[PDB]
Amino acid sequence: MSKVGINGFGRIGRLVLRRLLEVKSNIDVVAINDLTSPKILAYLLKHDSNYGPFPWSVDFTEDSLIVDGKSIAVYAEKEAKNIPWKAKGAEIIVECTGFYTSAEKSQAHLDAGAKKVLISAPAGEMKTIVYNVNDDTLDGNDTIVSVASCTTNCLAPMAKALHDSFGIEVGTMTTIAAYTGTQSLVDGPRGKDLRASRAAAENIIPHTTGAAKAIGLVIPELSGKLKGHAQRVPVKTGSVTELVSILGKKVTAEEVNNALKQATTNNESFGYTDEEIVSSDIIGSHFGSVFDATQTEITAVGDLQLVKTVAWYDNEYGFVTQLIRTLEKFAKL
Amino acid sequence: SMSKVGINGFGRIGRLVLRRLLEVKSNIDVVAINDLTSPKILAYLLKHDSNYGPFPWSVDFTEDSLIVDGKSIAVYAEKEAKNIPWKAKGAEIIVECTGFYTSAEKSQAHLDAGAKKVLISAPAGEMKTIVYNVNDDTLDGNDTIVSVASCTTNCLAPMAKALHDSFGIEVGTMTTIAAYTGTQSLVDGPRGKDLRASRAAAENIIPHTTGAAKAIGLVIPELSGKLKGHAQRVPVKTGSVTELVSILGKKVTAEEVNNALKQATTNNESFGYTDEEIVSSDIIGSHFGSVFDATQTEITAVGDLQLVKTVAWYDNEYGFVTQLIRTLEKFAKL
Amino acid sequence: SHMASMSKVGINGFGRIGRLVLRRLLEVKSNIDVVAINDLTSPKILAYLLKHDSNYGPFPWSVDFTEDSLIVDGKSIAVYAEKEAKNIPWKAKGAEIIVECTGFYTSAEKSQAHLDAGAKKVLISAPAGEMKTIVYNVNDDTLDGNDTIVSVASCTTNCLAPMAKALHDSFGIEVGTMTTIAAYTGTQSLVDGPRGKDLRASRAAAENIIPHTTGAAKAIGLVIPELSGKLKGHAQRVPVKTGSVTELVSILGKKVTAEEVNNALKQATTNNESFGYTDEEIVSSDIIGSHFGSVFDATQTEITAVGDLQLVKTVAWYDNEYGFVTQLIRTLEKFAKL
Amino acid sequence: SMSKVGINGFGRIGRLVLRRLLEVKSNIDVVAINDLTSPKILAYLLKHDSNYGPFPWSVDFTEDSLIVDGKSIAVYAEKEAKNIPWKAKGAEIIVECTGFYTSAEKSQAHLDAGAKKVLISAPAGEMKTIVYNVNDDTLDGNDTIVSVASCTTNCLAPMAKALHDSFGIEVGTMTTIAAYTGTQSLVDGPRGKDLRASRAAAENIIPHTTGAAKAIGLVIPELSGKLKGHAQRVPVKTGSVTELVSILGKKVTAEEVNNALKQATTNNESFGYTDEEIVSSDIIGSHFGSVFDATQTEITAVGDLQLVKTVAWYDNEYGFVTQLIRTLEKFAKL
Ligand SMILES: NC(=O)c1ccc[n+]([C@@H]2O[C@H](COP(=O)([O-])OP(=O)(O)OC[C@H]3O[C@@H](n4cnc5c(N)ncnc54)[C@H](O)[C@@H]3O)[C@@H](O)[C@H]2O)c1
Ligand SMILES: NC(=O)c1ccc[n+]([C@@H]2O[C@H](COP(=O)([O-])OP(=O)(O)OC[C@H]3O[C@@H](n4cnc5c(N)ncnc54)[C@H](O)[C@@H]3O)[C@@H](O)[C@H]2O)c1
Ligand SMILES: NC(=O)c1ccc[n+]([C@@H]2O[C@H](COP(=O)([O-])OP(=O)(O)OC[C@H]3O[C@@H](n4cnc5c(N)ncnc54)[C@H](O)[C@@H]3O)[C@@H](O)[C@H]2O)c1
Ligand SMILES: NC(=O)c1ccc[n+]([C@@H]2O[C@H](COP(=O)([O-])OP(=O)(O)OC[C@H]3O[C@@H](n4cnc5c(N)ncnc54)[C@H](O)[C@@H]3O)[C@@H](O)[C@H]2O)c1
Ligand SMILES: [Cl-]
Ligand SMILES: [Cl-]
Ligand SMILES: [Cl-]
Ligand SMILES: [Cl-]
């Protein structure tokens, strides 16, 4: 089975390898590109503030990591076209740096000798997969594909089930979400976004997201029907997405919950809970999204009805399990 | 006409009531406090505040009093309000902040013990419930026990009133992303019967019920039964935000919504406006009960259908207290 | 052939420590069986707290409940709700050893109520005055079959004692002072407000560095008699959920180098399931879930020397919740077999 | 005297330098700022502060300036100090707050770029290093590049000075339990070659090195080489504490230590005293470089051996900044 390279050995990139080893994937990770020394990547891989000690041995040499006894070449090329993917035969690149989020930009990996790129972020108008929502749209001719955001992977399965069961006419979402590396530790410049410049562990911070606006790449029938944003708050990982919808039918809360429960049955990407969990309970989830029946709310006056549905997601590990499900299929094609 | 206040419950709100009266140089004087602890400990907590920093006035204590800015305040430790000797120092209006007398029936005890009026710092069932600069005109001279609802009501009501007056609210649901409070838990452990309240508040996003929207009708009677909502409690110490998703009575643009809110906030001591990219710590110490944030307005339109999201910040401690004090100063003149 | 050791346990106080006691006993597949729990709350709430843990994540076994029990990994555990230990009906399911985790019975006088209630022995998860007090793999050889009520001291004691023991054995400790930079606990406050008579305990624990008294150093003589009255110290409670670190500054009986100290400490951690060693640049979250009572950190060793005066700073990490619990369980397993 | 200042690095320290200068109505004139960003973003950050709240003065900007309390401040964006055009507005003293010029050879660049003096907001090697009200009398009219050491030095030095003057410090070791800073990481990820600095600062106790004790001899020459120490960085946003364990030259009691420190803080604008049970958030906004805490003094004695533990609080941002400004004011006049 296919050989993989990881560009960007960050929060997502390191967890990609963790999850591939955890599921004993036949994918062989043969090369990693980042901006730093093997010694430092080894330290970051062995010790994780969110998920604890790495479950396999980690060592490094001057130019590689040794993970569970197996060598992974380490490169440090800030420009992707300079990465020597052919040296170890990396055919599929998991693109996790944040800096190649377009077909034009990730073309650099194919120029550098790879066959396919899976981008761990929204990447404009390209094929965009939420596993177990629209992964059947992948085919053998795709070369550059996106798995959208963590938030998309949370929102899409819930929106899909509601639309399939009842029709979504229009809706808006807010995700209350763990802070990430795009934000700031102390108040200081963070590119052009003013709110991103503010101390992330000390604030509720409004944040734009494209999860709702671009949902049509994943669920074409919902194109233009959703908007949304984020409130970034001081938890280290673990997030929750609220969606307020007008549906195509009057419903009860039990009816909505029953429809979602059916959508999560035999569904390794989309979980269900009716337990009164909190964000730390989603840390380490193996789902991309967990619908929370306890938070469903129907507000009605006359023939006007608003439906609020809520799903949790581990924006790090849970999303990564979706990235890996997509990678395994992308690599078989 | 009334000028002497007693505080029952010298907690987060109780202590800030005193701070704010002194800050605005009120003619109302706090003459007595009832709590569950010693003056030494109340002095410590009044002097040193994790959220608002050092108390701006001198504080000392004796065995049975606090001395604040050179003025003596009697301190009692009566667990049952009927036993508080309000008459000794002449406390006329009781600011009821314990959480344990949130009904006209329960707070009657303060009148039984010799006070003239009670202002409850929380929802208290179906009594007159005031958001200052929304419905404080409903107060008259015959009222003896009233509520100022919750911090969340004081955040939701001014925004909902402005939208309803301008456009009509047909139906809506709110979510407040809110600072954790003392009803929650420091470590995972029992907290009465409330499962989510049992979880470590500074390490979790925790869904939480609120009556702010369900009981809005007490403040805006035309919206009775038209709103629902809840909270997501998160790890900030104070400073919160309320999102409201509404179906309005006409099609609107974001600019139209924001300009209506700007007009409702103009020369409005209770209801502020920002179009700056603020975050929750910027609201700490706010002197408003609510601050509408025009940067977060969102209109989602599909044909005849339309969802309007409006967002307002609130300092659930100090900002709310400024509203409690506005209501108190008026309540005391009627 | 083999006469059965005591095997049935009751837990008083199904709190942070009590719930982890059960987790660790199942983890190590102990032959001890928790047959009963006493707390102040319903089975429903205990089952919710056992299943969902903010510090260690989902419980690794099934959890259900009835009106009067928990069902854990298919096994029934009776649940009682007696706030006075003397009233707990320990004899109904035959609880022999009580793991006393409420914080309300920290003396022999108080904890003997469990014996009146039908138990045979009590192990207290906290300092409990001058009773027999065990840090496993430091002084557990002082336990014998006539010990009926025993203490495992505090988390901080189980961190401090193995480091002090190694230093004292190797070099002599003449005098020393400890500061533990420690995760906040349930004795503190979520928001500023009264917390008994302790002023600092009244302040918001997740928003402050908070000085805090501890007896780990002052009572060390119960565990290392030669250091009785030679140590003092305190804690700085800080905003992490679990995971702590203890610094000891000592005058030793000999001049030393940092490498000599680190080597002595490494030797003391060898073949020692209670006491670990690291020379990696770890931080507190790396100790969460530790199976040691204490992990010596060679990277933080510091020798300050002016002439014949010398100060030695030695530092050990500890998971004040799970790491401490592993020590409590090691002591319980031995206690049951004496 | 010189009156015109430039700030290099408009960060946490750089912005608070400006805030404090205005707070104390200094006659110093900040005429220029160099950073890496646009006036728009610098204006936003000056106006809204997560640790100290809203800026007390008006703030606007243009494409190349800030307008603060009505006064124009030029904004440059030169990443190499030698290219900063300090002569355009005649900046004479540079307050060097980037962390990238912490040596005489590095900060020489500001002088080549037209400035007359540099005050570095950090340790900067073997140069004149001032803790105000410990050794500011060593500042000399010919000095042109000076350091104010670290926040931790400004905490440790006044305590060590008082102990050494009264009793003699023979040897000692320090641990500061300290708020996290921008040298650390928000999420786990590379942070130069510094492994512990690479770990999520608001979720960890993180040991780290500090020169505060090792270099104390620059400030208190008799203690050169007599102190060592380090830091534990923990999740509070600002507000820190320093513990010192010492062998003294004299047998002492706690009261004796505390009284000696009390006397050293009397009439001392840089060095405060408390015997209240304060916690870190109570030091936020302090106007001292250091506040000695008598409640934490500990004497451990066995026979003729004695260890003395003394503890001082410090606001590593604003408190240190008040010391930087004191030094700057004196520096400007020499
Ligand atoms: N919650 C999350 O963190 C999350 C969830 C879903 C998707 N994503 C997306 O995944 C991607 C990475 O997110 P992350 O949290 O892992 O960020 P991160 O900052 O933790 O990791 C980025 C890694 O890429 C390295 N890097 C940066 N530029 C590079 C370059 N030119 N070449 C090679 N390496 C480079 C960095 O050293 C770092 O190690 C982003 O696109 C992000 O939007 C993040
Ligand atoms: N914290 C907020 O953000 C907020 C906002 C709006 C309204 N409120 C409401 O104000 C009231 C107080 O809230 P808080 O955050 O200050 O809680 P708190 O726990 O900080 O204060 C409660 C105080 O009352 C004392 N107390 C409890 N029972 C008492 C009794 N029988 N007699 C005398 N004293 C007693 C307690 O010792 C404590 O000092 C509550 O009803 C709350 O719902 C809180
Ligand atoms: N948390 C730590 O880091 C730590 C470490 C070592 C030792 N300890 C000690 O372990 C003991 C428990 O600590 P914890 O952190 O689990 O406290 P906790 O507050 O989390 O648990 C106490 C439990 O006991 C229950 N309880 C209280 N009184 C009771 C009573 N009279 N009868 C029955 N149940 C009662 C409570 O409902 C709660 O569930 C304490 O003595 C503590 O000093 C704590
Ligand atoms: N934060 C504290 O507690 C504290 C206390 C005492 C001393 N210090 C020291 O003060 C200095 C700054 O500390 P800080 O906390 O403000 O750091 P910071 O990261 O908050 O601010 C540094 C500023 O310098 C800018 N900058 C970086 N490189 C630059 C360059 N080449 N040219 C122009 N601008 C540049 C950055 O954009 C930023 O605005 C450091 O030397 C630090 O050691 C910090
Ligand atoms: Cl949108
Ligand atoms: Cl509701
Ligand atoms: Cl002690
Ligand atoms: Cl040193």
Author numbering:
A (entry chain Q): 1 to 333
B (entry chain R), D (entry chain P): 0 to 333
C (entry chain O): -4 to 333
Give verbatim excerpts from the published study on this entry.
The enzymatic activity of wild-type EcGAPDH1 was 3.84 × 104 times higher than that of C150S and 8.13 × 103 times higher than that of H177A. Superimposing the backbone atoms from the structures of C150S.NAD, C150A.NAD, H177A.NAD, and C150AH177A.NAD on WT.NAD, it was found that the RMSDs were 0.134 (1266), 0.182 (1135 atoms), 0.135 (1247 atoms), and 0.122 Å (1219 atoms), respectively. This indicated that mutants have a very similar structure to the wild type.
